[PDB]
């Protein structure tokens, strides 16, 4: 028959042309495409479509998906589209039209007796975030991060010790093996970084062979040209990434000497803005280099009233795509549960201050949304060589998905899925007749329990550790994934964030300039995704 667009949106979620506001920000997205066939949408419930012989088929388990997310509004680096999402074997099977091929047309995601259903009509679905700047100061961080929508955590540490408080390094074979074993207990994907501060190659090779997927060079352990060159040499032969937190004191030289030691080799720079570390104060110039994959942390995102020149510049450099990643720097100058939240606050402030991006098309903020979401999903994944496993909603990838109600986008998730199972989600009174009565708060689910957890999470290993049989020796219970392609990534590969601007810094006034033009922004007095959502 015919149905009005408003009634349609209330029933199956918005369609092509409809705009949706992200939480309480000024950002608006518009559905670019809808993969459904009008009148053939699958819906679950009493008397609905997903029932035997109707929206549900007669096919065996091998010929149908395990889980189907119906009528989802996807927001990913590649598009903002409406579709059903099929999940099979814990991996993204397809993005298309779910249903029963026996009676429905254009069915690409078959639903059978073995198919579970998650109703996503009216919700926004995104990939799980990836934080690559974690100090393993305490294990309680993985839950805090999971609740915010971050499903993978890369970093280093051994617990609350001076070395870990200051740097993201897991020192040596013993502690590396210990942290790998402890990782099986955590509900997020994990990959460790070792101490890369040494001028003897063998001391680094041992660590990579023990299991680390990268080496963190931090100034507290001595970020000298000799150490930097040594870590990059080993990185080049073992296909692992190097994360740098440069010499702030200019003790061994200035930023130009650091860059010279790097020698055009691939490297991820921490706090490229300077605030939380780096050659005082022009480390920011690194974002102009092809071999540099730059990130900023959240305590400086965005430039507000209580947080100066470089801090104002950072927000702009993010909006322009000169900075490609956003991370936390957990409990050592950053907030583990605020990486996603702060990324959108910056996007909002930039929309408000700078207006539409040069790439925007239509009366929506679709492009700015794709550029910013890429910062904490796909780009971190490419930087650390794990983009073959996670990072985005693409077929064949691990199903680490996050479901959001538009009013709480970026702040409080409706469902956090890990490898095919819900790991954490808001849950009301356990003794109630329904799961909605108060008090509703985040509680661990079946995807976070013992053996089910192990099967739904990944421990990333370096190719060497994998070959040496580290997993079998440590008796690691979780699934294993190997990293690769850390040396071949460059600034141009960073999705929607490949700008290499001619950027300059004034050694005295600390002013940042791009092509001679002065870069700056004003501190905000009130931001969205703040006092309206949190109790404290």
């Amino acid at each position: 028959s015919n149905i009005s667009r408003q009634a349609y949106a209330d029933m199956f979620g918005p369609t092509v042309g409809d705009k949706v506001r992200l939480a309480d920000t000024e950002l608006w997205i518009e559905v670019e495409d809808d993969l459904t066939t009008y009148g053939e949408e699958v819906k679950f419930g009493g008397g609905k479509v997903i029932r035997d012989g109707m929206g549900q088929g007669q096919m065996l388990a091998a010929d149908c998906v395990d889980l189907v997310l119906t009528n989802a509004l996807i927001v990913d680096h590649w598009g903002i589209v409406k579709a059903d999402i099929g999940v099979k074997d814990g991996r993204i099977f397809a993005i298309g039209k779910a249903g029963n091929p026996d009676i429905q047309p254009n069915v690409t995601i078959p639903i059978g007796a073995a198919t579970e259903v998650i109703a996503a009509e009216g919700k926004i679905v995104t990939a799980g975030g990836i934080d690559t700047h974690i100090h393993w100061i305490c294990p309680q961080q993985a839950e805090e991060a999971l609740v915010s929508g971050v499903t993978t955590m890369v970093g280093g540490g051994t617990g609350p010790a001076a070395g870990t408080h200051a740097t993201t390094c897991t020192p040596g074979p013993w502690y590396i093996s210990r942290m790998l074993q402890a990782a099986d207990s955590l509900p997020v994907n994990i990959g460790l970084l070792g101490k890369g501060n040494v001028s003897q190659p063998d001391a680094l090779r041992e660590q990579v062979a023990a299991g680390v997927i990268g080496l963190c060079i931090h100034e507290d352990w001595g970020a000298t040209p000799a150490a930097i060159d040594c870590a990059l040499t080993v990185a080049d032969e073992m296909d692992i990434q190097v994360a740098l937190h440069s010499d702030t004191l200019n003790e061994s030289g200035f930023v130009e000497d650091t860059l010279a030691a790097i020698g055009g080799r691939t490297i991820h720079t921490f706090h490229t803005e300077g605030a939380g570390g780096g050659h005082a104060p022009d480390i920011i110039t690194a974002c102009a280099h092809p071999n540099i994959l730059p990130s900023s942390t959240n305590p400086t995102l965005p430039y507000t009233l209580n947080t100066r020149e470089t801090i104002a510049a950072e927000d702009v450099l993010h909006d322009l795509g000169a900075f490609s990643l956003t991370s936390s720097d957990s409990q050592a100058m950053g907030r583990v549960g605020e990486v996603i939240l702060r990324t959108w606050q910056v996007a909002h402030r930039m929309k408000v201050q700078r207006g539409a991006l040069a790439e925007e098309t239509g009366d929506n903020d679709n492009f700015r949304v794709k550029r910013y979401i890429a910062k904490y999903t796909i780009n971190p994944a490419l930087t650390h060589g794990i983009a073959h496993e996670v990072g985005s909603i693409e077929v064949g990838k691990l199903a680490d998905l996050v479901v959001w109600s538009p009013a709480f986008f970026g702040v409080k998730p409706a469902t956090v899925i890990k490898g095919g199972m819900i790991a954490i989600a808001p849950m009301g009174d356990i003794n109630a007749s329904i799961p909605t009565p108060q008090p509703v708060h985040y509680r661990p689910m079946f995807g976070a329990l013992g053996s089910a957890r192990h099967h739904c999470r990944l421990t990333f290993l370096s190719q060497a550790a994998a070959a040496n049989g580290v997993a079998e020796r440590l008796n690691l219970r979780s699934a294993i994934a190997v990293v690769k392609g850390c040396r071949t990534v460059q600034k141009a590969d960073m999705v929607h964030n490949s700008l290499q601007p001619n950027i300059t810094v004034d050694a005295q006034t600390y002013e940042v300039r791009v092509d001679g033009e002065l870069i700056t922004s004003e501190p905000a007095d009130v931001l969205p995704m703040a006092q309206r959502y949190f109790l404290f």
């Binding site: 001595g222 000799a226 200019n250 003790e251 061994s252 030289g253 200035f254 050694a507």
Partner: protein
């Protein structure tokens, strides 16, 4: 009464006693400040610091462990150095020695 209070006996501590030392005038010719740590090989500090690098070979700052000396742009000052010990083998820094001496 103060929980866990110290009762430090008065006096002073002589540091790095029995070791060769030398004073050197150092001028920062850079536009950005430079800070050097107590155990850094002085002969391999930031090239912007002008001084007799030859005399400072195998020497470090004769200051309390963990502290540092700052040099503002255009600053000039005389510092005192103390000779490395142990095996007297230098590895790292700017990579100028990478061996004994």
């Amino acid at each position: 009464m103060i929980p866990g209070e110290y009762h430090v006996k008065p006096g002073q501590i002589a540091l790095n006693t029995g070791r060769a030392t030398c004073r050197v005038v150092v001028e920062n010719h850079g536009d950005r400040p430079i800070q050097v740590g107590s155990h850094y090989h002085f002969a391999e500090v930031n090239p912007a610091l002008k001084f007799d690098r030859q005399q400072a070979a195998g020497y470090r700052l004769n200051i309390p462990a963990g502290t540092a000396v700052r040099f503002e742009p255009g600053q000039k000052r005389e510092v005192e150095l103390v000779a490395f010990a142990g095996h007297r083998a230098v590895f790292g820094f700017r990579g100028e020695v990478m061996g004994p001496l």
